[PDB]
Design a protein around this ligand. Sequence first.
Ligand code: A1IW6
Ligand code: ZN
Length: 107
Amino acid sequence: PGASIFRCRQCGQTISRRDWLLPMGGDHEHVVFNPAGMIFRVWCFSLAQGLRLIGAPSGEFSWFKGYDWTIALCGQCGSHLGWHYEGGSQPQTFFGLIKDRLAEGPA
Ligand SMILES: O=C1CC[C@H](n2ccc3ccccc32)C(=O)N1
Ligand SMILES: [Zn+2]
């Protein structure tokens, strides 16, 4: 399989797997805008590794009802890869990662 692991596009750090994609609200892809109007194509993952979660969670402008977010950087290079979500149910936690900041390839 050549499409099974997601790595940081900037450095190659191991981040997630196609197996760990999560359909939240019926789709793994969510297109969203931050308060500064920046558009992100976000893929939900049940699980991710190789990140560094920055600060404490915030509910402010959460794209996912009932979840608080933390900034998720690449733990290797510090590139902004997305957010970790916590404090909801089914599931309690998940990752929302910026699709175009990942590279897909072989295990
Ligand atoms: O679910 C989220 C993640 C963080 C994101 N976000 C990105 C910048 C920003 C500044 C203030 C509050 C929120 C912010 C967002 O809009 N929603
Ligand atoms: Zn990186």
